[PDB]
Structure formats: C-alpha cells, structure tokens
Design a protein around this ligand. Sequence first.
Ligand SMILES: *C(=O)[C@@H](CC)[C@@H](CNS(=O)(=O)c1ccc([N+](=O)[O-])cc1)C(=O)O
Ligand SMILES: [Ca+2]
Length: 240
Amino acid sequence: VVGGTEAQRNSWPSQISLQYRSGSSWAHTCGGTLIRQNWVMTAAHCVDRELTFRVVVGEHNLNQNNGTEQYVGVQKIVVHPYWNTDDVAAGYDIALLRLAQSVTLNSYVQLGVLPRAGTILANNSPCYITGWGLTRTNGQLAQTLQQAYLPTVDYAICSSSSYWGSTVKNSMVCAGGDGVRSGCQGDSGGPLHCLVNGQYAVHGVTSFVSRLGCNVTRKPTVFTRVSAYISWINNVIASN
Ligand SMILES: *C(=O)[C@@H](CC)[C@@H](CNS(=O)(=O)c1ccc([N+](=O)[O-])cc1)C(=O)O
Ligand SMILES: [Ca+2]
C-alpha cells in the first residue's frame, strides 16, 4: 500500500497473508480474505506460479512474532475457470483456497463479510485497501499491515478514456487514483473493505495497478468485484 497508515491489529481480522516457500523460509506474495474457517478468497494471478503456498491468519507484522498468528497449508486451489494469466484485463481474477485445517476465530481472525450479489457501490463510496504490499512504486513490502482510504470510482468514470478505458470491466471495482494512495505489488488478492449501512464488507479482491506505477493519478487500483462472483464462490464451497 502506498500512502498508507499502519492498521490497528484488530481492525481487519479477515485479512490473511498468502506466502510461498522460499528455501528455508516463507515469503509473503499476496493478501487474501478469510471467508470460511477453511477457505480463503484471493486473486487468481497470485497463484499463477507453481509454488508451495501457506496462509497466515492473525498476522500483523511479517518480520516479528505477534503472538497471534495461525499458519496453515493450502490443500486445494480453485481458480475461476475463465481466468487467463495473459489477460488480467479480461477479469475473472479470483481464486479460492481450501485450507488444510480450519482456523480458530478470535479478535484477530474473523470471516470477511461479503456483499449481497449484484451490489454496485455509488461513485466515491468509502473504502479502505489493506495489505503488506510495496509502500512505494518499485519499493519494498511493508513490515506492518497497512491501510489506505480509497474512495470508489464508478464504472462510467473508471472506464473513461483518461482513466482505464476498455481495460476496466463492470465485473471490477475501481478505487483511489489520487496519485498519493494506492495498492501496490504484494497487496494483490487482499480485500477492499467498504462501509455500507454501518458495516464494512469486502467488495473487492485487489487485482492490478498501472504498469507506470502504483500511485498514478487517474489510474485507480483495480479490484475484482466480489458481488459479481457470489454464486461462483458458493458453488465452489458447496462442491468442495
Ligand atoms: C497486485 O499485487 C498487483 C498490484 C495491486 C500487481 C500484481 N500482483 S503481484 O505483484 O502480487 C503478483 C503475484 C503473483 C504472481 N504470480 O504468481 O505470477 C504475479 C504477480 C500488479 O498489478 O502489478
Ligand atoms: Ca508476525
């Protein structure tokens, strides 16, 4: 997250860290949202590489023991069947991870609330992106979980020529684009939390930023619109 602030430890209990085995250790690669005690929602592009993955729930500082983490392997990966790694702009950037063990819920570990199917937010709706992604374009991951206020940019504006044009689809949510705050590499897969009727709900799965940089004016961070995939998500969890 560029232009973020450190999140309080219990603000976003559904945020997870998706990591891959790196020799003797594990490295953060993407965020995710815990949606069942044994299921995580993340971006399909986060699991394009054939790596060994684990999920960390109750994480706050990637480089220190927080005394709250639970570590679980990934037992199954279900990517949306229409995902294509060479066309992120086509959409379908979503995947569900079945965990090897069910995690235990507490103030640091909770299920993310998902919007009702079809819900579309009005332009400029209040949302926060969270994650450990780079803190600057071409920078380094954050140590502590970061959050940034990114108001939505509706489809008509976001798909306009000076913003993202045809690259943005109605199955995506755009948020931010102020040139200061944004998602960045490593935030992909995590949640976009938006306040609707007094409750934060995960409306987006972080998907992409401009190739020009993370925080680019009129290139808001782009997320898979969760409310477009409620049936798909329920079908996968019921069939697995
Ligand atoms: C996500 O982090 C976005 C920026 C919000 C970037 C791409 N995702 S990534 O850099 O985390 C990533 C993760 C995993 C793979 N892979 O497994 O192939 C690839 C990229 C972005 O849009 O640059
Ligand atoms: Ca930690």
